[PDB]
Amino acid sequence: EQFAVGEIITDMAAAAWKVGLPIFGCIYLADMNSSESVGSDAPCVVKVEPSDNGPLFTELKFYQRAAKPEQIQKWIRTRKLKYLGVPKYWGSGLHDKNGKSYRFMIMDRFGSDLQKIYEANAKRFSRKTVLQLSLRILDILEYIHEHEYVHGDIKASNLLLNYKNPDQVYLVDYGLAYRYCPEGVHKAYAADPKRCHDGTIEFTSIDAHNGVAPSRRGDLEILGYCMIQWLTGHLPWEDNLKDPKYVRDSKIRYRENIASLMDKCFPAANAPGEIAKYMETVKLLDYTEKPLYENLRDILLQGLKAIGSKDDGKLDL
Numbered sequence: 001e002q003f004a005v006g007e008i009i010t011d012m013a014a015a016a017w018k019v020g021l022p023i024f025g026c027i028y029l030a031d032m033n034s035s036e037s038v039g040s041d042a043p044c045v046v047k048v049e050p051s052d053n054g055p056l057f058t059e060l061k062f063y064q065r066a067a068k069p070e071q072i073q074k075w076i077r078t079r080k081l082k083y084l085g086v087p088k089y090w091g092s093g094l095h096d097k098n099g100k101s102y103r104f105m106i107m108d109r110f111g112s113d114l115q116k117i118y119e120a121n122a123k124r125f126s127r128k129t130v131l132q133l134s135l136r137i138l139d140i141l142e143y144i145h146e147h148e149y150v151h152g153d154i155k156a157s158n159l160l161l162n163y164k165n166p167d168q169v170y171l172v173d174y175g176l177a178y179r180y181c182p183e184g185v186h187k188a189y190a191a192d193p194k195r196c197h198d199g200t201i202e203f204t205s206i207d208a209h210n211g212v213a214p215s216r217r218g219d220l221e222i223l224g225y226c227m228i229q230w231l232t233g234h235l236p237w238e239d240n241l242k243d244p245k246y247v248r249d250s251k252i253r254y255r256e257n258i259a260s261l262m263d264k265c266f267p268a269a270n271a272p273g274e275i276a277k278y279m280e281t282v283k284l285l286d287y288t289e290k291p292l293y294e295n296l297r298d299i300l301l302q303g304l305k306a307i308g309s310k311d312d313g314k315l316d317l
């Protein structure tokens with residue numbers, strides 16, 4: 001009960017918001033202050049945590065730095081995108097309840113997460129779906145990377161559909177995002193003592209497993225594991241998630257021979273070539289290396305040609 005329904009809160013820019021019903025975490029629907037109350041079709045949410053919470057601070061800094069509405073709209077215009085799946089930041093402030101200090105932030109409201117939809121579809125997405133999701137995710141990753149950040153936890157539960165457009169997917173949850181290149185100086189290949197967050201074990205990068213700070217190649221690697229999970233319903237190491245050593249060992253061995261990962265994950269000889277080629281390309285990245293995002297997108301587009309489709313932006317969920 002951090003907020004009352006109908007409570008009006010004011011952000012640092014003196015913009016007024018009204019809180020709606022609660023919705024993982026402490027999150028409520030929200031809208032611009034008005035006489036009417038906040039509908040079930042509200043266009044915003046408000047995320048609230050104690051002011052001493054580290055993740056919300058990390059997240060807020062990400063949103064302020066790289067997710068300003070104009071900043072995003074400029075990129076979309078320049079890169080000629082249909083949309084960009086980075087949630088827009090609308091504001092933030094402080095809020096007292098019962099004598100303790102809380103930090104809040106206002107973001108875009110979305111529809112369903114992809115994990116619910118994945119489960120509802122018997123833990124499979126079509127090749128078409130996976131390729132269309134992945135092309136959009138590569139747009140997102142390129143954007144955040146160019147703004148000095150990596151996400152480090154890409155997965156279906158952090159991917160939400162636009163409330164008004166089911167063909168547009170957004171990456172959320174920047175609470176453990178990492179500023180890999182502050183002021184254009186890439187972090188060295190070593191642990192960051194301020195970070196102890198390892199990601200989601202089934203999907204996380206070999207770099208994260210090794211205890212080094214996440215970088216761009218790691219985000220791409222994570223997406224790779226997601227693509228296989230979505231296509232097949234499985235990953236090779238999924239029965240041993242309690243043992244990080246095992247998971248790391250398996251990922252390293254599979255990275256060494258991608259063909260054997262394809263043989264393991266796909267029924268013999270049925271392996272989509274673009275997935276192998278994607279994984280081969282990511283494997284060649286150095287820790288500090290800037291990915292060629294267009295080449296990666298090109299690889300996935302060949303997959304769309306192979307199934308007699310095109311990048312029409314249809315997710316087919």
Ligand SMILES: C#CCN1C(=O)[C@@H](C)N(CC#C)c2nc(Nc3ccc4c(=O)[nH][nH]c4c3)ncc21
Nearest residue numbers: 023024045087107108109110111113172173174
């Ligand atoms: C009503 C409804 C649908 N709906 C939900 O059911 C669930 C999935 N959640 C919470 C989560 C995740 C939602 N979250 C948002 N918005 C944002 C935006 C930015 C972030 C961010 O950076 N971290 N979490 C975020 C949630 N919109 C709708 C939902």
